[PDB]
Every structure is written in C-alpha cells, then in structure tokens.
Design a protein around this ligand. Structure first.
Ligand SMILES: *SC(=S)N(CC)CC
Ligand SMILES: CCN(CC)C(=S)S
Lengths: 308, 308
C-alpha cells in the first residue's frame, strides 16, 4: 500500500521449458515454479502487476480449432487469444493463491481478461512475424504450407519452423482503468496475458482483429500508463548480451540498439520495450531471468536500464 | 457509487438462441443484445455484477480437445472451463464496453477469471448430471458411448442427447474479495462464467477438479457472499410458472417447490437458487426474461421472490 509498483512480464519458460510438451500438468508445474519467484517480490513489499506471453498456448488453441472444424465451429485467432488468457490466467492465479496460502497470507489476486487496441492498418496484417504454437521440422513445415497456402511458417531461432501471425503495435490497454484501481487497492493483478486480445476501435466500437501482440511491447505500454516504478521482463537468460549489460544508461543502450547490436536473438523487442518505458517515465527497466528477479530489484544482477 | 447492487445471471439465450449453431458471430450478436438490456440497469444506476452459464461453450471446447487429441494435447474439463470463461468473458466485456461508449460513458468493466471450490466428495462426481455442448441423436450418442466407453450421454428437456459431467454444489468463490473490491469501486464486474472453474482445496493448495457447476447456485452464493441487494436470474422465459407467478412470498414459493411445481422442467435449480438467497439474506431474488430485466427491478413484472 506504500510499496512501489513493478510490472513483470513472464516469458515462455513460465510454462514451457526447452521443447517440453504443452500438456496441462507440465505447464502447471512450470507455473508453480514461477509463482514462487514472484511471491518473493510480493513479500519484499512491492505491488505486482503480472503479464506473460502467449506463443505456445494460443498456437495450440488455434491448432485445436483447425483440427476440429469438422466437428465444432472453428474460432478466430482473437477468440483463441481470449481462451489463452482464461487458461494462462487460470494457472497463474491458482499458483499465486497457493504460494500465498503456503505462507499463511490470504489469497488476494486476480486475472482480468484483457483487450488491447491496435491500428488495423498496421503493416503487420500483411506481414505475419510472430511465431506461435508447436515447432515443426524444416521439411515438416515445407509441406504443411504446400497443403494450406494460406499458412505462413518461418525458421525460429534455429529450433525449427513455426506458424506465424500478425503482430501489430499495441496502442491502448482497454482495461487500463480497472487495473489501476486493483493495484491502488493492493491486489496482485494478472493481466495482459499474451499481450491482450488484439482489437480495433472504429467509431466507438471495439472488435477483435486476428493477431498476437508482442507481450513485451504491450507490457511496456501498460507499465508506462500506470506510471509504474519498475518494468521487469523475465527471461531464461541471465543478462541481455550483445558482451553482457549490467547497470546501463538510456543513452548507451540506445546507441547499442540502433547499431543492430541486438538484431539477432529474441532480445530486440525486449530491449525496445525497456527503452520505451525508461524514456516515458524515467524509471528503471530490468531484463533478467525468472530465476534472478528479486536479485535484480535488489541491484545484485541483471540488465538494469536507467535514465541519463 | 450510491447504487444498490444487483447480481445478474445470464442464461443460454444470452449467447445461443434455439437451434443456432455456436460460431463466433452468432454468439457475439446474442451477447450484444443482452449487453443492451444490462446497460439499462447500469444507467438506472445499479451496481452490476454479471455472471452467466457455460454449457454450450465449455462443451464445445471439450469436444475440440477430444477431437484434436491426435494433434494437440487434450486439456482436462476444468482447464476447458477456464478457457470458456476467457471467451465468454471477453465477448461480454467487449459488448459492455461498446454499449457504454455508444452512450458516451467511458468504459468501466472487466471480466475476472473465477475459481469455485467444491466438495470433492459431492455425489455428483460418481453420478454425472449436467448436460453440455451440442444435441446428438439416440443414434449418434451410442456410437460415441462405445467408441468412447466412458463417455456419458443423456436426454435433456426432450430435444436430444448430450454429454454429461459432474455438477457439484459450490462452496466458495475464491476471487470473492477482489470482486467486492471491484463493485465497491463501481466497476461493472463480470465473473463466475458458467459457475467458475471447479476446484477443491486440501492442505491449503487449490487444484482443478473435472466438473461444471450450476451457474445459478454459484451466483446465488456469490450474491449471498457479496450481500447483494438483489439476485437476478435472467432467462428467455418471463416468469417462474407452474398459475402465473408475479410478486410472491418466500413462504409460498417454497411450498410450490415442495408440491413439486417446477421439478421436471428447467426451473428447479433457479428457484432453489433464489429461495436460498432471499432465505439467507431477506433480499429480493428476481426471475424474469432478459427482455424484462429493468421492468422487473422496476417492480412492474417478473417473478419477484420476497421474504415473509
Ligand atoms: S549473455 C550470454 S553470453 N549468454 C550465453 C552464455 C546468455 C545465454
Ligand atoms: C418470451 C419471448 N421473448 C419476447 C417475446 C423473449 S424470450 S425475448
């Protein structure tokens, strides 16, 4: 209630380790591991807003929706997104309620279904870039496409090939006002799972567009709207590398960015979201592993991005 | 801020009319027509908690998970419920946002993923009861029940066959405290979609159990815990009939239930629900149609159950 606010973005490893399978039990066990790292942040007295990504979960749901179109009507990707929030938000808040009760603190936590407005004219709708669901073999992918020419797949960090979808820039977290209310009251809020159900607003009406927003760009948005004290991005990497970055200034990480020093790995969007947050608020952004989250806040490690 | 609280439970006709197929646009429209009716109550200045049922939606998701098992990991019933909460909740909060903005009130609504504790030793777990998904033929039910020995199907109000799942009585809404924080702050809250994801607690750890909870009892319990000033079960039918029932007594409606006046149709749990709320709270339960929600509160029509 006097504690500072940290907005924390979980990554894949909160549910799926290096190419496990997305069965419920595997994911829950992963989420219970994450929930104990996050609790420490709560215990240290910070107010927490928890987001996460979508990739495998919405991918799997859209896959189940194609594979069963014969039997049950097929749902659009935005509706699949909605279902992923239900699912992810469910594991998250169940795992957080158990860690709460495992420390004899009454459960006080919610997941909010979350819409995120985007520009329908965004170039991302002509150019899918965001990998989702399962990994396929180069040859497995090559032929999956020959079957369904609509389907686009691409090679994902070398690990294999993946279905790819539109990933527009997030403009507004629709439920922003309620989230703010909930942290003002010290609720551990879970939301913006997978970046929010992409939508557009067109003369006073919101409707779902088919896409998966970047979990980092969208969490940066939310964090800066909430005028949060910290932005944390949680990976399975100990540091954002280029060499690794420890405490680093906005000026520097900026020059390092425009010189394509992050152009390879998956760190490009994360670095971009840290930068945007620190530019907009002047407060610190952190990129560390799920496993060193408290320590980063404490100054002990991670990449901490700071104002000039 | 000054408004009384009404806890409102939507029925099927909220998302599916009779003989409609459960694709997205069909469901969105029905939701949109209900958002319109519910927005009158908000305008009248009531504090609104919105709940709904699940049956056709969670059934569909479970059928998708079954049908796509060769390709994607099939998820348990409780997870499928959470996914339906995300989908219904999304549709509902988006319609609500749209009505608000249509009438120049900025949006202020959210859907909360909800868990409902139940007793793992409820008799319903070994006597599957709650119908779910789409209607089959006597023909179509036995093939399924024989290619699936353990699939269970039964008739339902005289229209055809349907999968059947444990329907345990609800003991507690886990997110209750956060829901109450929300109406206290004048957020139109949508929760308990289909009665909430059935869970059990043992040893201070919550875990999903494979059921589907009757939406009405769960809202009755929610309203009862919230100390709502009203309980509204909305249906497509306009009175809890047997003689027409207008404003009626707790003494009397109780008797009619015992003289078995609702017993075989589709009212039993709804009247039980209301009786139980008014009984524990001395507050008014209502059972009108969607088309007459305001009018009912406006003490024009309905079934208005009242204490002696
Ligand atoms: S940073 C850096 S150099 N690495 C690889 C050891 C992080 C995986
Ligand atoms: C009772 C029929 N009706 C209006 C005539 C609705 S269910 S909306």
């Amino acid at each position: 209630s006097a504690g500072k606010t940290v907005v924390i973005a979980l990554g894949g490893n909160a549910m799926l380790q290096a190419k496990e399978k997305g069965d419920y039990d595997t994911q829950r066990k992963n989420v219970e591991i994450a929930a104990s790292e996050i609790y420490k942040i709560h215990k240290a007295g910070y107010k927490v807003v928890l987001t996460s990504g979508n990739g495998p979960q919405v991918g799997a749901i859209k896959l189940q929706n194609q594979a069963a179109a014969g039997v049950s009507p097929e749902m659009p990707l935005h509706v699949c997104g909605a279902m992923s929030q239900g699912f992810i938000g469910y594991m998250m808040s169940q795992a957080m309620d158990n860690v709460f009760c495992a420390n004899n603190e009454p459960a006080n936590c919610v997941t909010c279904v979350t819409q995120t407005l985007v520009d329908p004219k965004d170039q991302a709708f002509t150019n899918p870039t965001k990998p989702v669901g399962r990994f396929y073999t180069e040859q497995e992918a090559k032929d999956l496409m020959a079957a369904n020419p609509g389907k686009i797949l691409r090679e994902d960090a070398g690990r294999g090939w993946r279905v790819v979808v539109p990933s527009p820039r997030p403009l507004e977290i629709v439920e922003y006002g309620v989230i703010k209310t909930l942290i003002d009251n010290n609720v551990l809020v879970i939301c913006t799972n997978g970046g929010g159900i992409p939508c557009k607003r067109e003369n006073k009406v919101i409707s779902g567009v088919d896409a998966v927003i970047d979990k980092d760009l969208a969490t940066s948005l939310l964090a800066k709207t909430l005028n949060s004290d910290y932005l944390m991005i949680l990976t399975d990497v100990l540091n954002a590398c280029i060499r690794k970055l420890e405490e680093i200034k906005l000026s520097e990480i900026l020059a390092l960015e425009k010189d394509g020093h992050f152009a390879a790995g998956s760190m490009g969007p994360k670095v971009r979201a840290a930068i945007e947050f620190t530019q907009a608020t002047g407060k610190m952004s952190i990129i560390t592993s799920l496993s060193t989250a408290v320590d980063a806040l404490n100054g002990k490690c991670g990449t901490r991005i700071i104002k000039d």
